[PDB]
Symmetry: D2
Subunit: 174 residues, 4 copies
């Protein structure tokens, strides 16, 4: 069992709204790059970029960051960057990280630290489809599809058509 | 004096708000916009046109007019409804009130009451271009163009093309 | 079957924090009156008043509002809270009034309370403190002071127990039925 | 000058309220340490620690992080950690960073990086007296004395008695 929170239509409308928020807050998307985290983040980033191209008429560059969980186990797991593929110079550019779910914030901090270390973007923003709460760092998403309250024993399933052959956000037990 | 939104920023805020309204109401079926006073009504019409463009269905726009009444002896004026024109039945429908500036919240409270003498809507939401803070009632906007905390000794000037021949939001010293 | 969200200590901490937020935002609680809604709101208001008296050294006046649900459109359609009585022992004109309730949900109860106060007096402002905000607002109303956000799903509600009313202090979420 | 925002009394009330928030959210402040950034942050952390102990009778440890702005030209400056004095093991502990003003977020990110790398706290929170907006990273304060959006062309003056012989927060055109 699992409670469906967003269906395909609700995902589409949240992403469309997010695109218009990005255009609003960046005053056009000139000099902005989207960088998706991991598989689902990258597909979200591509969906946003296509939407923005359609709205403004200019392409938006999309990069990728890969992040993987390392364990003791010996426990605090640690996400570490395994690779980045960003096809343009980010220095003095606005970078928007994109991910499916925000939870502790540790994945984004790794992504942020990587970008800040390797380039000097003028700013880094964050867009997520879901914020599930329970942050363990002072990190917040600038753009949020849906706030989904959860308990620690719950997990959010994000399905995307490209990866999963369904567009759906649902909450489930472990 | 600061300019806070220029014409382009106003347009992008209203476009975003339209998409927010479609999102949260899951399509703007069974949802009506009601504008407060002159500028709110024009903002409501702008939002309605945008929504029609996005979803392909018209959205009904109503109007509420609200006048300030005053007593003798900074404060104590009371906004009262002086007319409403809502062209459809609002009972069991979602209504979104629309205004330019949220300040004390007293004007919205007068509008919220009025709505309830014309239908029992299933819910009432509020969209404003600017929230300037200093609420005197527990009222909040659900959709906000720009959140702009101000001092009591400041004022927000909202100009709209339909009324003022220019689109702008700026803050100036009340003094 | 319920999850305890706040125990007696966490309720005390939230209310203590709320008292300090009130003092901060009102820059002292001079010319402020607390008005509790229904039974549990009133007891919360009294607790908050006692705390504020302790912090600032001056008593805070507490009033009461009673509010009851009426039905039926007779077609079922949404119930309407109406004010049944109010006991406010001082003049509120030009005073700050803080409404106090246990749980904020649609906002309709507070709108009735607010409409009443604004009608019969002309306070300089009205604020709202609640122990719990459960979400699902149907009106543009928010609490100024909030003990705990406890979002509820469709089948859930929030149980609030207070020592004065329930012989125990606890906030828990439960499945209705 | 352009505006006062907090006088002494307001600073005292905001810090008292913050202390109560910290007791509430951390359920007492057991296994929680405050770390002040730079001179003014450290004085704020000390005021908060003293208040917290008075409320429930439990002492709070205060550490210090020093952070200096490095420049590449004589507006992309970089705050770097110059020193830290953390007097207890922070592994599996909650840490609260404390500063006077949050602006771009880059100072906090440097401080965070300094903690997260050199201890493994269970979480890191942030308390500030003023949030002045214009963030350039997805960083937010958990505790805020006063939320004060500003233009890039104004500065926030924070005066604290320990240093400045006056308590005040004000905005200045600069
Ligand atoms: N689908 C899903 N991903 C999660 C969930 N919690 C964490 N994640 C994954 O882990 C990262 C977020 O976790 P955090 O690092 O913020 O704790 C994201 O890359 C996300 O894909 C969840 O509840 N559901
Ligand atoms: N244009 C402008 N209108 C204001 C301002 N403050 C209040 N108002 C107007 O008065 C109403 C809101 O004031 P409130 O009733 O919320 O105090 C709105 O209808 C708005 O048009 C302001 O600072 N600028
Ligand atoms: N950026 C900026 N904000 C101001 C100025 N004056 C007032 N404000 C904003 O409005 C609030 C004023 O609230 P007051 O305490 O004056 O009622 C401040 O907290 C701040 O957020 C100003 O000169 N510049
Ligand atoms: N104990 C409790 N009371 C509730 C709950 N939901 C609504 N209420 C009660 O109903 C009123 C608020 O409901 P509203 O009018 O905001 O929909 C309050 O007076 C409160 O006592 C809940 O989940 N638990
Ligand atoms: N007093 C003051 N300090 C500031 C201001 N802007 C940044 N800072 C200092 O710089 C840090 C925050 O800047 P950030 O790194 O967030 O851009 C804090 O350590 C703070 O003391 C300001 O406007 N006034
Ligand atoms: N109240 C007030 N806020 C200001 C003033 N100047 C700037 N701000 C705040 O700072 C924000 C950003 O300023 P901007 O970066 O757009 O110049 C404005 O949206 C506004 O909230 C001012 O003179 N008074």
């Amino acid at each position: 069992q699992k409670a469906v929170i967003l269906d395909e239509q609700a995902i589409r409308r949240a992403l469309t709204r997010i695109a218009h928020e990005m255009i609003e807050r960046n005053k056009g998307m000139n000099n902005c790059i989207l960088v998706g985290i991991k598989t689902r983040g990258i597909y979200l980033a591509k969906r946003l970029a296509e939407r923005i191209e359609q709205i403004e008429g200019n392409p938006v560059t999309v990069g990728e960051i890969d992040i993987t969980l390392y364990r003791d186990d010996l426990s605090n797991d640690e996400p570490l960057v395994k690779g980045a593929d960003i096809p343009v110079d980010i220095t003095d550019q606005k970078v928007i990280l994109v991910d499916d779910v925000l939870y502790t914030g540790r994945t984004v901090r790794a992504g942020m630290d990587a970008l800040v270390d390797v380039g000097r973007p003028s700013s880094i923003q964050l867009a997520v489809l879901v914020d599930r709460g329970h942050r363990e760092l002072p990190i917040r998403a600038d753009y949020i599809g849906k706030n989904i309250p959860t308990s620690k024993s719950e997990k959010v399933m994000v399905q995307l058509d490209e990866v999963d052959q369904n567009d759906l956000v649902a909450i489930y037990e472990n």
